[PDB]
Structure formats: C-alpha cells, structure tokens
Amino acid sequence: RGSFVEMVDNLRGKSGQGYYVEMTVGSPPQTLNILVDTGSSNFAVGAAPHPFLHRYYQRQLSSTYRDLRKGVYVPYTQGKWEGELGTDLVSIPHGPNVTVRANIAAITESDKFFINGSNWEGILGLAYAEIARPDDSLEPFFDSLVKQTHVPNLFSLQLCGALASVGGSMIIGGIDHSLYTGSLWYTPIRREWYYEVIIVRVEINGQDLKMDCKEYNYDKSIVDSGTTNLRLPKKVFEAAVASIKAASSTEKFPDGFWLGEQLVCWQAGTTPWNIFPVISLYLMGEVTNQSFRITILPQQYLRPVEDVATSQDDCYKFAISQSSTGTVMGAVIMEGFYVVFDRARKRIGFAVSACHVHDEFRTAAVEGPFVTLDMEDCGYN
Numbered sequence: 082r083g084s085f086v087e088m089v090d091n092l093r094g095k096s097g098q099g100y101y102v103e104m105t106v107g108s109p110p111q112t113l114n115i116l117v118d119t120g121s122s123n124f125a126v127g128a129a130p131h132p133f134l135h136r137y138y139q140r141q142l143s144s145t146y147r148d149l150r151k152g153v154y155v156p157y158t159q160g161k162w163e164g165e166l167g168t169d170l171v172s173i174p175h176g177p178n179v180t181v182r183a184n185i186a187a188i189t190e191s192d193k194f195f196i197n198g199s200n201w202e203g204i205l206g207l208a209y210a211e212i213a214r215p216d217d218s219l220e221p222f223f224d225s226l227v228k229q230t231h232v233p234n235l236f237s238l239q240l241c242g243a244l245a246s247v248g249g250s251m252i253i254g255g256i257d258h259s260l261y262t263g264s265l266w267y268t269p270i271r272r273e274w275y276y277e278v279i280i281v282r283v284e285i286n287g288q289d290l291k292m293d294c295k296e297y298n299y300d301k302s303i304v305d306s307g308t309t310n311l312r313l314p315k316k317v318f319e320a321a322v323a324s325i326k327a328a329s330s331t332e333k334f335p336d337g338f339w340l341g342e343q344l345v346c347w348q349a350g351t352t353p354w355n356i357f358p359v360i361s362l363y364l365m366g367e368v369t370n371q372s373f374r375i376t377i378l379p380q381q382y383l384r385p386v387e388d389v390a391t392s393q394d395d396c397y398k399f400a401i402s403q404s405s406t407g408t409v410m411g412a413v414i415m416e417g418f419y420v421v422f423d424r425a426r427k428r429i430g431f432a433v434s435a436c437h438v439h440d441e442f443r444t445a446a447v448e449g450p451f452v453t454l455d456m457e458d459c460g461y462n
C-alpha cells in the first residue's frame with residue numbers, strides 16, 4: 082500500500098497520441114504497447130499486419146489462446162474496428178507480478194482507429210462491463226484481474242504532459258504517494274459504466290458561469306484518459322469560451338482559434354500564459370452539501386503542436402471543445418492531477434500531480450471543502 086516503485090514511470094507516449102503501457106499476451110509472451118483508456122471497456126489489440134502497426138498479436142503463436150467463436154463489430158463517431166473474441170494469458174511487465182486469463186478482441190479490420198506514426202497497437206479499456214462490446218457479459222480486463230488475483234480493486238493514473246515524449250505512471254492495485262502533493266479529494270462515481278461524476282459549479286478565473294448546473298452534466302460527465310480535450314456540453318462551452326475570451330481580451334485571436342479550426346503561434350519562449358485564465362470545476366464531494374474544486378492552467382488547455390511543418394514558431398491548439406456527449410474530462414484535466422480510480426469505494430480521487438506543467442505564478446490546485454446545495458439536481462436523468 083502507498084509505494085509501488087516498479088510501476089512508477091511505466092507509461093510512455095508522444096504529444097497528442099495518448100499514453101500507453103507495455104503488456105504481454107499469450108505463451109510464450111508477446112510484447113505490445115497498449116493505449117490506456119478509462120473511457121472504454123474492451124481490451125482490443127491489432128491482430129493483423131496493418132501498415133501503421135509496429136507489432137501485432139499473432140494468436141497462432143500462443144499455446145494458451147482460446148477462441149470464443151464470436152465476432153464483434155465496434156463503430157465509433159469516426160472510425161471503427163472489427164475483431165474476433167478469445168481469451169489468453171495477459172501480464173503487465175511493469176505492473177503487479179501476476180498473470181490473468183482475459184478477454185481479448187483480436188482486431189482484424191479497422192478504420193481511423195490506429196494512428197499513423199504512433200507506437201501503440203491496442204487499447205485497454207479500464208471502465209465497466211456495462212459499456213463493453215458486444216454486451217456486458219464480456220468481462221473487462223480489470224474485472225478479470227481483480228477476480229483472479231489478490232490485486233486490490235483500484236488503480237491510479239499520473240499523466241505527465243510535456244516529436245516530444247510524454248510519460249506517466251499507472252499504479253495498478255494502489256496509490257503511490259510520491260506522485261502527488263497536498264491531499265486527495267474524492268467525488269462519487271455516480272454509476273459504474275463510464276467513470277461518470279457530477280460537476281456542480283464552473284468558474285473562469287474565479288468567476289462563476291452561473292448556469293443551471295444540470296447543463297454541466299448534460300447528458301453525463303466522465304473522466305476519460307482516451308480523449309485529449311476538455312469537452313464541454315455545447316451550451317456550457319459557449320458560456321465558457323465567452324468568459325475566457327473576455328478574461329484574455331488584452332489580445333485578440335481569430336474566432337477559428339476558439340473553435341479548434343486554426344492554431345495560434347507566438348515567437349519561441351514568449352507564450353503570454355498570464356493573459357489566459359484558470360478554469361475550475363467543482364465536483365460533488367463525499368458528504369451531503371459538500372464539494373471540492375480542481376483548477377487547471379492554460380498550460381493544460383493550450384496544447385503545443387510540434388509538427389507544423391509550415392511554421393518556424395511556437396503554435397498551440399485550444400483544447401477545450403464543444404461536445405454532444407456531455408462533459409469529458411480528457412488528458413487536459415488529467416495532466417493536472419494524480420487521479421485515483423477507487424472502484425472498491427465507487428469514488429474518484431484527485432490530488433495535485435507532482436509532475437504537472439506550471440509556471441512560477443500559478444499552479445494546478447485541488448481545494449475544499451466548499452458548501453454547495455442541491456448537488457443531486459445537477460445530475461441528468
């Protein structure tokens with residue numbers, strides 16, 4: 082409990098391509114890099130020589146592979162994958178010292194799923210059986226892990242943002258206290274499908290947006306390591322952009338910047354971080370009428386875009402975007418914080434991440450308690 086030196090720094094990635102962990106599947110073990118995704122529930126790996134993939138799962142080489150004789154077709158908003166279901170032995174080399182027999186979807190056809198130039202070749206869905214494909218009887222990886230071993234039913238994620246390499250830690254079965262400063266504050270998991278939570282108040286530079294709080298969770302809010310942006314429901318995004326624009330008035334930007342339709346660039350070394358406001362989300366706390374708040378910086382929500390082969394300078398993408406699927410606390414929130422997915426107690430903890438990017442005027446923050454009434458009304462039904 083509290084100290085997991087073998088798992089610290091077991092995540093890697095490149096800016097904008099996600100965080101992956103090394104895993105092995107089959108006997109003898111086949112090594113694969115697997116995207117860590119708290120916003121889905123399937124363990125699905127490339128199983129055929131797609132030209133973007135460095136490595137793929139070759140079932141015919143595993144003596145422990147069992148075929149489930151069932152296909153799975155999974156369409157997303159953009160892109161899709163299709164695969165064949167099976168189970169095999171799975172390990173995490175920089176994880177606990179155990180082997181699990183787990184469901185795997187061997188991906189045999191996909192479209193817009195794998196990223197050209199990325200170093201991962203499958204996805205580890207860490208959320209619950211209820212959003213598993215094809216249905217909730219396909220047991221997710223983490224549930225198999227907790228059933229078959231003595232690993233405690235929680236994991237924690239420290240995502241450290243930055244061609245450029247990102248890194249992080251996924252502590253499986255526990256919390257490592259060197260990964261955060263101050264205290265952890267916990268918000269209830271409202272329902273176990275996504276890691277769904279409830280936002281009770283939103284402030285821009287300390288100014289309340291003053292919306293009905295059910296607008297903040299329309300139709301859900303979730304914590305998702307497999308999404309880059311802070312996504313906000315359309316109505317909330319309009320109000321939030323309007324405050325942000327007002328708060329940073331000392332400079333003007335094309336409208337398209339705020340919509341993610343164009344980048345903005347300044348000369349190297351001179352990003353004026355200080356004209357942009359902090360953003361605070363208050364979350365439902367553990368006790369009636371009690372909330373706490375997490376605050377991120379422009380260093381989290383203005384993301385550097387390295388590969389602009391038609392510019393000299395320092396270009397950034399605005400990484401807060403409008404959503405129709407509810408609020409998504411993606412890598413933009415999570416790179417501020419050490420986040421604890423405490424499934425045994427159905428709660429999610431946040432603490433200031435010991436690695437988050439900041440400057441000498443401001444820092445990400447997790448603070449409470451605050452008195453907030455009517456937090457139950459904030460959930461959408």
Ligand SMILES: CCOc1ccc(C(=O)Nc2ccc(F)c([C@@]3(C)N=C(N)OCC3(F)F)c2)nc1
Pocket residue numbers: 096097098099100116118119120121157194196204305306307308309412413
């Ligand atoms: C800081 C960068 O963070 C990231 C960058 C890229 C990526 C990435 O490619 N994610 C990614 C790729 C394919 C995919 F299928 C998914 C799914 C299943 N999972 C989530 N939660 O949302 C989109 C999705 F439902 F389709 C995510 N993720 C995080």
Ligand code: NA
Pocket residue numbers: 227228229230231
């Ligand atoms: Na057990």
Ligand code: NA
Pocket residue numbers: 258259260261262263
């Ligand atoms: Na600590």
